[PDB]
Motif scaffolding. Sequence first.
Motif, short mmCIF file in Angstrom:
data_model
loop_
_atom_site.label_atom_id
_atom_site.label_comp_id
_atom_site.label_asym_id
_atom_site.label_seq_id
_atom_site.Cartn_x
_atom_site.Cartn_y
_atom_site.Cartn_z
N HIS A 1 0.66 -13.54 -3.71
CA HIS A 1 0.44 -12.60 -2.63
C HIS A 1 0.67 -11.16 -3.05
N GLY B 1 -2.54 -8.53 -3.68
CA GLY B 1 -2.32 -7.23 -3.11
C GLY B 1 -2.53 -6.08 -4.08
N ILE B 2 -2.18 -6.24 -5.36
CA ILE B 2 -2.34 -5.08 -6.27
C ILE B 2 -3.78 -5.11 -6.93
N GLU C 1 -6.91 -5.98 -5.10
CA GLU C 1 -7.64 -5.23 -4.07
C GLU C 1 -7.80 -3.74 -4.31
N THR C 2 -6.87 -3.23 -5.08
CA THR C 2 -6.13 -2.05 -4.78
C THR C 2 -6.49 -1.04 -5.90
N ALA C 3 -6.40 -1.56 -7.18
CA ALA C 3 -7.19 -0.91 -8.23
C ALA C 3 -8.63 -1.03 -7.93
N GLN D 1 -2.96 -1.81 3.49
CA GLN D 1 -2.73 -2.30 2.14
C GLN D 1 -2.77 -1.17 1.11
N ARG D 2 -3.67 -0.20 1.29
CA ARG D 2 -3.72 0.91 0.35
C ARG D 2 -2.49 1.78 0.45
#
Lengths: 60, 420, 420, 59
Positions: free
Chosen positions: A50, A54-55, A57-59, C311-312
């Motif tokens: 999780h 989450g990381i 998605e984020t890049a 989330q960001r």
Amino acid sequence: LDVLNKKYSLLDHMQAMRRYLLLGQGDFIRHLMDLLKPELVRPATTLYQHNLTGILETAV
Amino acid sequence: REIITLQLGQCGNQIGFEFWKQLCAEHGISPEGIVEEFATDRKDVFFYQADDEHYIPRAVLLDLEPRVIHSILNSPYAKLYNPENIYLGNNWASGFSQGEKIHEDIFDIIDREADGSDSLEGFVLCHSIAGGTGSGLGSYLLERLNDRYPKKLVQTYSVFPNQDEDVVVQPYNSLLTLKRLTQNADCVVVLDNTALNRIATDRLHIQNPSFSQINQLVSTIMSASTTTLRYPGYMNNDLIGLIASLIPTPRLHFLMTGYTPLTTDKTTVLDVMRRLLQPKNVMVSTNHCYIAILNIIQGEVDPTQVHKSLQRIRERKLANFIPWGPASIQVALSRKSPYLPSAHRVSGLMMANHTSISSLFERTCRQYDKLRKREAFLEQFRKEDMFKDNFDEMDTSREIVQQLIDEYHAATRPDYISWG
Amino acid sequence: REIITLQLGQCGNQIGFEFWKQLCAEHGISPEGIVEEFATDRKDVFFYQADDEHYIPRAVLLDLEPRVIHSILNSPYAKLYNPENIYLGNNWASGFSQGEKIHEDIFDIIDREADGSDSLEGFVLCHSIAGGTGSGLGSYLLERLNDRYPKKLVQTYSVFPNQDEDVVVQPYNSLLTLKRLTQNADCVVVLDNTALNRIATDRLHIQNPSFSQINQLVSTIMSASTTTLRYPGYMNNDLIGLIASLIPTPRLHFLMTGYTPLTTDKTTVLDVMRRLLQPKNVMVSTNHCYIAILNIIQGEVDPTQVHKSLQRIRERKLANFIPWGPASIQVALSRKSPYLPSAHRVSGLMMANHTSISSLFERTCRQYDKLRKREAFLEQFRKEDMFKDNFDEMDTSREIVQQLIDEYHAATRPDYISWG
Amino acid sequence: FILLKPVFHCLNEILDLCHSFCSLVSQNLGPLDERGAAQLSILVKGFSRQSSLLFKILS
């Protein structure tokens, strides 16, 4: 062949299995590994998907 | 990550403006700052990126007694840049004290832009060695930024003054600036005035607009040397991974440049590399040998032919160094730039650590020592007295460059396990 | 349910009239009170609703020594409102005693309107902190309404005076009003004069009609902060459910505001939220950290993108608090207002509990203590003598705000299980 | 998750625990023990017990 390379992007998959799986992209994956250092250096029994999802998605 | 550009001195602000116009033409923007709809490109490393379609270039406009900077200021490109860092003799101590009094407010401007920035890899200085008003001041601010951020890298692009000597105070100024360049700076890109002068007098028969053409040549070099950083790279697209191999020891960190098209007023990688090892492609003019060599190639290329190429360079033995240790000639590749037509589609650059620059240092070591024996060339004013009453910083500088020459000579020998 | 609006003080009655005209323009009515045939709208929460097509706004017109209120009274909107609550120095004790003598008849007017009303959730005060004639009186009537209805909530919209100090009695007045604001009031919306002043001097170069533009800005804020109550909401469309999360303890109940369009003289929720965490969007100017954060967004929106958005913000870590406990940034949504054209269709607001306001409190704690050491700034008149002969209410006030600063500092620490 | 799952029963249990909690705090009004400590201790243990159940699927 035609309907496969347009309707399911058969070529783009080939573009992205060397770029992404095999670090042929280069930048995005180093940036991933750079974000992934303090998490992965911990003993992995205390880590779960999780935070990684989450990381990621984020890049991306 | 991202790198903040700092520009200082007259020649430095000139080549900075030339580089920024070079990248505005290179990338998809108009001279209003307005992003163009006409476009391997990234503009996030040197330009502050908003949504706002005015990507403000990350250049700190600092200078001492501005005169060319006003002519730079009124321009048809001056709508693209406005980061508000503009501020208002030719000796080292005078410029040093003049930078010394105003360092806090300009460092507050630096802190402002560092606060606005999220990531940082290095500070790259547009600089001229012994440029007069730029020097002294530039070394002091270099000392300030090197002190204030110890986790960060510092790079300089600076030209070494070589007019084959007449400035009577140039060995003092360049000598003191060099001492700060070794001990307060860690990445130095060295270029000579006279080699670019001879290349310019080779291609044309001009002497008057020489600074213009030299600006163009060096601008091509700073774009090429940063292309793998700005264009999406995966092998030493960081500065530190680039100059890791060329710096074997943190005293010896000096680079000369190469470039294959020189005088134009098969194309295979074998041929451009065999070109680039020639000393007429080097922009800096008892055998002195390389310690480590790196090169980049930008073009539309194969990989079996580079294998034959570097194999050919190997069997040619046309690069005969013998430092002490198992380094290589390092072949690396970057993207050839789209969005503008360029001649010599296959173009190469080299950065290496070479001991030949010690000879150039020894020239100043001779010259300054002669002037130190005469003592009429320090000019001996109140700025020089208040900077150092005994001028013992000159002796500390001299012994530092003396240890540097010893480090050069020990590095050329097969024993560098032997310390002094 | 329904909420009764109370207005007091010069600035408070100004922004109340501005808010009522804002909602007459916002809703389907004419300035006669006559309902318009031109229309997510409810007018039942703040306007007494009849059949009678004159929806009388629930605002109690109370004031001390009225001068702007007469100019408000003769207006081309004064046919829409007439609830008959109109009544006729700048020190805290003077205004306090002046409200003290007439509190029963104006409370009879309050009882009249409360009797006419069926449901009630809160009393919202238009107020100015240390406004002179408004303060003292406003704190006393606040004490009366807080005493008389213990089952009800009290909210204030009040601006904190900040002119960067010269009023010699302002720390005393604002200090005593603040003591009543913590212990006789439970919901405080804090705003600064100087931040709105700096935003107004950012967009324009005016200093003279500043109160007009400040009225407009704060009016937008009080409409936005109440929009989810007035427009049909289902997530904290009550005041108590709204400020439940932001009040972890009934001593710490203070809110600062945010708003994305600031100086205008992708649009995604990711972008407006990353905007809103910046301190230039906050209307109030050793790290002080948030305790709990709530935000509302009004626009025409998706829900997968708010998932990516928050989330960001999470992976950005651009909101770095560490109070003691597992709260969140709380994303909530309200209806964007129809029936009037508005710029920035995607518009966000934030209310959080932040310890930075303790620094502002400490400013007054410094200032008043200095004046208490000098003792020439209490002004020492008969109203001040009859209010408190020993001025021991000042000491009780001081120890209360002292305990409040201790509660701030313990709340910022990871231990707030540790009481003093 | 209104579809029949173990998580569905778990949320039902959450609701009943919360409802009994509201029922307890209603008459207590202000904090002073009316021998409410026993049931309160059961409830605060139950919250930790059910909070562990969300840690069953943590991938």
